[PDB]
């Protein structure tokens with residue numbers, strides 16, 4: 001009961017934030033698609049990614065071990081809004097370096113929130129429902145992403161100045177400066193809305209009183225240490241395996257979506273990349289639908305069994321995708337996300353549940369494996385080009401899902 005209301009709030013707050021955030025995702029390109037283009041500095045943007053999803057996690061966890069989950073969530077929510085707030089001004093004065101800075105900051109909020117919010121929800125109540133809790137909250141996440149794209153993308157990209165790069169090319173310098181500014185001007189109000197949303201969320205959390213948790217506690221001082229927590233983590237095996245599992249999931253997932261439109265265009269005559277995007281959309285819908293249903297499953301059933309089931313089906317879909325072509329392989333690929341759905345939350349929960357003190361530090365690592373999303377692309381490109389076509393590369397995701405299934409039948413403990 002006292003575990004329940006905070007939870008429902010977290011869900012709504014997951015949803016809400018999920019809107020403010022993917023809202024930020026729609027607009028950020030515009031800064032870039034307007035001030036096009038550049039070479040070296042582009043790599044600097046990708047670095048925010050590793051920064052936030054590799055560096056910040058462990059420190060974040062340390063913050064948490066020493067303070068708590070709410071502390072980490074708060075600062076994470078704090079980091080995000082600060083970083084998001086930097087954009088508008090960097091734009092309005094055309095200071096890139098400032099933009100880049102806010103980007104790293106918002107990037108840290110992300111790694112911070114990831115490492116914070118996930119273990120928190122699964123611990124937010126009885127041990128069994130840890131998996132269902134995280135999954136359901138993640139559904140509200142997915143759902144929030146749904147909404148922004150819907151009620152938001154249309155009702156917000158119809159106020160931003162469209163421009164054929166050719167017109168931009170033909171502009172005088174004065175004109176270009178004028179354009180760029182009118183552009184950053186149109187987005188700056190929705191950004192205030194965003195930050196506003198992010199803030200209120202942070203607010204509600206401070207207002208919200210949660211019950212205590214054997215994993216937030218401090219009864220240790222020496223053994224509460226990093227390496228103490230760490231040396232203990234090696235055997236645990238299910239944790240060490242979920243780590244490997246999440247690396248693969250992220251690799252798998254980005255392999256699928258990142259290469260999807262290329263697959264479509266090279267596989268189906270005559271696809272425009274414009275039209276292919278439609279399939280990409282369907283994928284996110286499968287993903288949300290996939291999660292809703294999977295969570296209904298996670299409530300009825302042993303999570304690992306659902307995880308294992310889903311891992312197999314997705315791997316199937318991918319083999320089908322790799323060996324089929326035309327529309328048959330496409331649909332299989334785009335339908336695959338319906339089964340990726342449950343995977344990340346379920347992997348995460350099986351992974352920690354249950355680590356107690358080491359829950360925090362264990363999470364820091366699971367988060368870092370998001371680096372796998374980055375490591376896969378070269379391999380996708382490599383295998384793809386080495387083979388002459390996109391589909392044979394789709395064996396790689398499949399290879400991931402396979403591994404993940406092994407974990408599912410290897411999630412066990414005690």
Ligand SMILES: CCCCCCCCCO[C@@H]1O[C@H](CO)[C@@H](O)[C@H](O)[C@H]1O
Nearest residue numbers: 010013014017018021113114117141201
């Ligand atoms: C009131 C508390 C609000 C806390 C919200 C924590 C959100 C954690 C969600 O994980 C993130 O979701 C993104 C999509 O929304 C993904 O793209 C990204 O990979 C992942 O890192």
